[PDB]
Design a protein around this ligand. Structure first.
Ligand code: HEM
Ligand SMILES: COc1ccc(CNc2ccc(Cc3ccncc3)cc2)cc1
Ligand SMILES: [Cl-]
Length: 412
């Protein structure tokens, strides 16, 4: 059929778009007119990838199919982040293969099995009470300030405290853990142009390996002991493997949940009936509707290891496919009224945590609990908050971020 009505040369991973807006109309145009569409990229404008473009995947069923067929669609070959600075060295992309997110089976299979020790329901549930207490304190302190930056005073802290609590990081070290985590992402935004993710990753690996050594001597009931204690088959994370795990967690556990909270509250400010309902019932289905609406990871990619026909399109060996979760989470064929913010939506089969498959987010229930606890605390302590000015969006080609959002917590 006809080509999609998009500006010539439009690139759905272009950070300059996301610094201003989410390209919602553009995604909808692809879902209607070219649900799998070749996103060409000019020389030097591939965000670190120099292969001429990628297949934009905009339908949820296609995202699920790619995610399920990890034997064909590789995370390791080019990593899963679809956009870096245009001049990033290839070697700096490949160094990402040392975290489980960017590995294929069988290496991924072994690590995921080991790490599952640290994300058991029980391990995560043991954090409930401390995170609830921290959430109430966070909201109380924010409301006492009267007004300020919702991103910094409400959204930022609890995700970091969850990481710290899961890993058993001493309180006196959480400041520097928080700093390292915040130095990893956003380096294409002018506000964060001076961050040094490679240096922070090295400091965190050094910190983490020291912790692994210490926790081997004196086991504490965090996840670390489960991760570095050999099982019957001698399987365990080496000290450097634990280091790479902490790097992965410090990044994965921070800004995505933060941006879920900020954009969830933006959604409530735009939909007062849902906010009144939330305050009255406190439905935990709200967390999944918040993640669907926020889709904090706009997109992750894969690379075909062989020719593969996907919904009538011939994917060729070596080509990248980019799963636009932001499009799939508003797929009219899966969601009733996807553009209605409905905190009771149930079932809510969004792919904000990825598609079902080998790499499905291991932190999903930790994220959902963080979100439910903080919105309860917001409803308890600042039920009448009112935005003061527009949010400032993050310049990124794959993360949907809010840097700042001024709100009046007392709403007067
Ligand atoms: C709302 C918050 C979050 C969102 C939107 C999110 C999103 C995602 C997505 C899309 C994936 C899919 C990877 C893929 O298919 O290539 C994923 C995987 C993963 N997530 Fe999350 N995530 C969130 C919170 C967290 C948290 C809190 C943690 C840990 C504390 C975490 C740890 C991970 C890990 C380790 C993986 C890789 C799993 C593997 O490769 O086997 N995430 N996440
Ligand atoms: C130098 O060592 C390294 C190794 C790997 C990495 C990148 N790892 C990474 C990439 C993307 C995300 C985003 C995400 C958020 C929530 N859930 C899942 C994924 C998290 C971690 C950097 C430096
Ligand atoms: Cl609905």
């Amino acid at each position: 059929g006809p080509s999609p009505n998009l500006p010539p040369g439009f690139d759905f991973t272009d950070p300059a778009i996301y610094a201003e807006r989410l390209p919602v109309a553009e995604f909808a145009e692809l879902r209607s007119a070219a649900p799998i569409w070749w996103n060409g990229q000019d020389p030097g404008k591939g965000g670190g990838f120099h292969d001429g473009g990628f297949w934009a995947i905009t339908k949820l069923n296609d995202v699920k199919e790619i995610s399920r067929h990890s034997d064909v669609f590789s995370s390791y070959e080019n990593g899963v982040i679809p956009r870096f600075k245009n001049d990033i060295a290839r070697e700096d992309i490949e160094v990402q293969r040392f975290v489980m997110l960017n590995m294929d089976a069988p290496h991924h299979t072994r690590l995921r099995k080991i790490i599952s020790r640290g994300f058991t329901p029980r391990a995560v549930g043991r954090l409930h009470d401390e995170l609830q207490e921290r959430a109430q304190k966070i909201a109380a302190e924010a409301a006492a300030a009267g007004s300020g930056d919702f991103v910094e005073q409400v959204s930022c802290e609890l995700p970091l405290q969850a990481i710290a609590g899961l890993l058993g990081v001493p309180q006196e070290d959480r400041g520097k853990l928080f700093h390292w985590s915040n130095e990893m992402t956003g380096n294409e935004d002018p506000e964060y142009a001076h961050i040094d993710p490679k240096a922070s990753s090295a400091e965190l690996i050094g910190y983490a390996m020291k912790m692994a050594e210490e926790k081997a001597k004196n086991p504490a009931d965090d996840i670390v002991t489960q991760l570095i204690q050999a099982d019957i088959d001698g399987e365990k994370l080496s000290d450097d493997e634990f280091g790479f795990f902490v790097v992965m967690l410090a990044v994965a556990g921070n800004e995505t949940t933060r941006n879920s909270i900020t954009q969830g509250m933006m959604a409530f400010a735009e939909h007062p009936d849902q906010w009144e309902l939330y305050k009255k019932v406190r439905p935990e289905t709200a967390a999944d509707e918040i993640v669907r609406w926020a889709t904090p990871v706009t997109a992750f990619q894969r690379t075909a290891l062989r020719d593969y026909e996907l919904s009538g399109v011939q994917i060729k060996k070596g080509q990248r496919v980019v799963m636009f979760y932001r499009s799939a989470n508003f797929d009219e064929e899966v969601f009733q009224d996807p553009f209605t913010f409905n905190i009771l939506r149930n079932p809510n089969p969004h792919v904000g945590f990825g598609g079902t498959g080998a790499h499905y987010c291991i932190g999903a229930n930790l994220a959902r609990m963080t979100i439910n606890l903080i919105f309860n605390a917001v409803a308890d302590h600042m039920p009448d908050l009112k935005p003061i000015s527009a949010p400032e969006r993050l310049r990124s080609g794959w993360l949907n971020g809010i840097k700042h959002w001024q709100v009046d917590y007392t709403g007067r």
